Amino acid sequence: LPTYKLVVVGDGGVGKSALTIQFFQKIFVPDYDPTIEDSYLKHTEIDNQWAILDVLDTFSAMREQYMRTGDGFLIVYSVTDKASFEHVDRFHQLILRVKDRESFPMILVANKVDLMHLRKVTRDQGKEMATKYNIPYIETSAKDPPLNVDKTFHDLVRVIRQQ
Ligand SMILES: Nc1nc2c(ncn2[C@@H]2O[C@H](COP(=O)(O)OP(=O)(O)NP(=O)(O)O)[C@@H](O)[C@H]2O)c(=O)[nH]1
Numbered sequence: 642l643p644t645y646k647l648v649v650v651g652d653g654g655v656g657k658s659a660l661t662i663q664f665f666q667k668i669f670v671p672d673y674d675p676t677i678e679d680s681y682l683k684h685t686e687i688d689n690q691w692a693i694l695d696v697l698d699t700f701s702a703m704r705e706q707y708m709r710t711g712d713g714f715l716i717v718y719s720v721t722d723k724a725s726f727e728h729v730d731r732f733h734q735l736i737l738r739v740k741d742r743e744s745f746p747m748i749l750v751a752n753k754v755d756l757m758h759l760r761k762v763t764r765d766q767g768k769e770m771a772t773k774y775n776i777p778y779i780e781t782s783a784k785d786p787p788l789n790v791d792k793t794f795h796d797l798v799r800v801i802r803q804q
Pocket residue numbers: 651652653654655656657658659660670671672673674699752753754755756781782783784
């Protein structure tokens with residue numbers, strides 16, 4: 642029974658926590674930022690193959706353990722936060738250095754696309770960035786009813802399996 646350690650990274654406020662709690666617990670709780678580090682563990686079936694998903698919602702010995710051991714990374718920015726998108730490169734570079742690899746399983750996640758009037762990063766900008774890194778691109782909303790939240794996590798597992 643394979644365990645996949647997934648790591649969610651990105652700037653403050655982009656929705657790492659909201660995405661994770663939506664995926665594991667199927668709720669959206671506005672302006673909830675966890676008091677303590679919460680680990681996430683669940684059995685789920687992806688393309689008929691069962692897996693344990695072990696997720697870190699990112700000093701911390703825990704963080705750096707997951708950065709080192711992680712099987713795949715979600716790199717999240719918010720479409721309403723241009724800086725968060727500009728900072729994606731820091732996260733991409735950080736991950737490749739820690740894994741000492743030229744590529745590693747990862748998905749670029751453009752979150753908060755429900756806030757349409759506030760969108761500062763276009764679909765095509767996002768897609769062009771993902772292309773530059775040769776990684777998948779997906780748009781999400783953690784807000785109910787959620788968009789692409791299961792697909793995002795399941796797709797990362799698919800990337801890991803198909804490497
Ligand atoms: N409308 C909308 N709000 C969202 C979405 N995702 C997160 N939010 C909201 O944005 C705020 C910040 O989200 P949060 O999940 O805590 O972000 P974070 O990346 O975990 N922040 P941190 O790095 O500081 O832990 C919260 O108020 C949350 O409800 C989304 O898809 N749509």
